[PDB]
Ligand binder design. Structure first.
Ligand SMILES: CC(C)Oc1cc(C#N)ccc1C1=N[C@@H](c2cccc(Cl)c2)[C@@H](c2ccc(Cl)cc2)N1C(=O)N1CCNC(=O)C1
Length: 89
């Protein structure tokens, strides 16, 4: 057993649509399922594989924006700030 926290139903949907290893994880575990989700869903640019385009996806509707970069993680962590509680203080 993991001994960690469950994100809300829409966010858990992204992670399960990716194939997550439970319903209880840390920020660093939950966000790893986004990387595998995009790699399976191939939501990145043809020109820039590290640039992500979630427009029309559940992950995009949940982000509230069609795009972010592997070099700019900020809006993911902000979508977690209010969806997911962590050990961090
Ligand atoms: C899925 C595409 C976009 O990912 C990549 C492609 C490239 C290129 N060119 C370079 C890097 C990745 C990358 N970098 C990480 C990452 C770590 C920390 C922060 C962030 Cl934001 C990203 C993580 C990932 C995790 C969450 C998300 Cl939301 C998206 C992507 N991520 C991967 O999931 N990877 C890299 C390793 N092998 C794989 O098969 C997939």
């Amino acid at each position: 057993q993991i001994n960690q926290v469950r994100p809300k139903l829409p966010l858990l949907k992204i992670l399960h649509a990716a194939g997550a290893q439970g319903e209880m994880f840390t920020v660093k575990e939950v966000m790893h399922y986004l990387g595998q989700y995009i790699m399976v869903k191939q939501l990145y640019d043809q020109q820039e594989q590290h640039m992500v385009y979630c427009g029309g996806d559940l992950l995009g509707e949940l982000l509230g924006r069609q795009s972010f970069s592997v070099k700019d993680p900020s809006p993911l962590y902000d979508m977690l700030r209010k969806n997911l509680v962590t050990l961090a203080t």
